[model samples]
Target: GGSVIVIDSKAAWDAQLAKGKEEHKPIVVDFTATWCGPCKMIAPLFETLSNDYAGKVIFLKVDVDAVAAVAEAAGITAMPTFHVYKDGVKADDLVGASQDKLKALVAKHAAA
Candidate 1:
């Protein structure tokens, strides 16, 4: 895993999303909390998936406390939320640490 880039502030998030929009790439954001156990459990998987899909997709992680504006704009309230942005719109969400679900959702997008 090259490490799923950690999201910083609103500007950076917007910049990346803008690029995603322009390039029509699948964008995945993990809205996670530092204190959330499930978020920690799935962090590595998310990272590795980012590495795996590096060329086809962009993966990012936002800490709810650290990036409040982004988390709010993304409309995620749960502890460990996954949002998939397709064509610049949110297309799906998975709010847990289920590795199988993550695997399927990712592979679907990564596939042709």
Candidate 2:
């Protein structure tokens, strides 16, 4: 179950962001909400793919409710949003429940 790191606070998330920048790996944040059905459905898929990506990517899960400040600054408007950060900056984003899109998004940044 070495899937990924769960960020429940802004401080921890920022630290992870810094770590990702240092490692030169993409910071992929999964902005999710507890009450969202699609968020729950694709959670396992996200974690499973986390194992696949392993060292290539730094996976993060942020509950919009749990950390509203982070989500707001990141400008999360949907239940589930995949925000990719490259070189310590926001690069791209994908908003949906599509597992295919999620994986492809991660793979795209993981390749960098």
Candidate 3:
């Protein structure tokens, strides 16, 4: 069973990133904000992607405001930024609410 792991603290982010690295899994992290309307609208799609790629891809959600340090370290300046990490390194990133583009991003990384 796979669901989005909500990162609320810097410690949690560190642990999750380490876990993903140790497991050799591609991680899809959604850096979002509560007040962002587009983020709210695309939240469901992100959840669906998590489900579809369960076990294959690690899905994470980080609220920019809730975990400001993580957001800052990740270089997230937009409301709904998506980052793909592999081997504990940022492999790719997307900064928008495009459903198709996000799904494509997942597909690209989930395969590895």
Candidate 4:
């Protein structure tokens, strides 16, 4: 089975941003920490949504401990920070776990 692509560095995030510009597909970054309970709670939902959306958008995950620079660059002070990038720019952010809100966010950004 194929796995979702994960991005872990500022460079990777930059590449995704560039790709978003070239392909016009929004970039969704899921910033999470191993110790975060809420982040764990949302993991399954995020995976399901990523599979459901498939090729329509760029779904990426960054571990806060592994990608501290990337997370800090995005001003992420929380455990789970969900950012939506459109045309190479961050369009919106969801700071915590909320399945319904995240679903609505994905629907709002997924290609029309």
Candidate 5:
């Protein structure tokens, strides 16, 4: 069973963000909620992207309930929002659970 990196603390989030900036890697964050059915539906795809992207992209999953402050600070108003960060800055975001859109987002940023 493989799993992506899960951000469960503010310190981890901050450190990862800094790492992305320092390394110039794209970070794809899945802002999800535990009670969200849609989030659960897309969880496997997210994990797959994590594996596929590997060293090219940093995949992170942030549970809104576990890290409420980070979610609020990031302005997460939905259960399953995906944010793409390049050079530590948010480059793009999607507010739903569409696998196609998520793939497109990752592919667009994962490019060299």
Candidate 6:
């Protein structure tokens, strides 16, 4: 199983984003909610991708319900909002659960 770095609090999420910018690693922000079925389904795929691209990227999962402030700041209106951050800026976004799309997105941004 793959492990994903959980960002349960707003402060930690902000700090992680800052760190990602400094580290020059793309941050994969997974905005999920407990009640969201699709979010749960796609989680493992994200985890796998994270582990596969470990050093090149940083994966962070944020529970939308738990971190409302962060979700609002990011303008997240859906259950699972996948955001790829490069240089502390959002480079891409994929909403909903689609492993193929996720894989393609990761491939597009991940270092080869």
Give the whole-model CA lDDT for all candidates, comma-separated.
0.71, 0.76, 0.77, 0.73, 0.78, 0.74
**Whose lDDT is higher: candidate 2's or candidate 4's?**
2
How far off is residue 3 in model 4, in Å?
A: 8.5
Q: Candidate 6 on 23-79: residue-level lDDT in tens?
A: 455677888887887777677668888778765577888889899888888888876
The best candidate by lDDT is: 5
Clashing pairs in 3: none
Q: 1 or 6: which has the higher lDDT?
A: 6
Candidate 1, residue 101: Cα displacement in angstroms equals 0.9
Residue-level error in angstroms, candidate 5, position 66:
1.0
TM-score of each: 0.83, 0.88, 0.87, 0.82, 0.87, 0.85
- Tens digit of lDDT per residue, candidate 5, span 10-93? 888777766555256677889888788778767676988898887658788888879999888888997688897776678889
lDDT of 6 at 36: 81
Clashes of 6: 0
Least accurate stretch of 10 residues (summed lDDT) in model 2? 1-10
Q: Distance (Å) between predicted and true CA of 35, model 2?
A: 1.3
Q: How far off is residue 16 in model 4, in Å?
A: 4.4
Tens-digit lDDT string for candidate 4 (1-112): 1124665676766665565553566677788877887776677679888888776576777778789987888889876888886546788888887668888888888844
Candidate 3, residue 79: the lDDT equals 68
The weakest ten consecutive residues by lDDT in model 4 span 1-10
The full ranking of all candidates by TM-score, starting with the best, is 2, 3, 5, 6, 1, 4
Count of clashes in candidate 5: 0
Q: Least lDDT summed over 10 consecutive residues: which range in candidate 5?
A: 1-10
The TM-score obtained by model 1 is 0.83
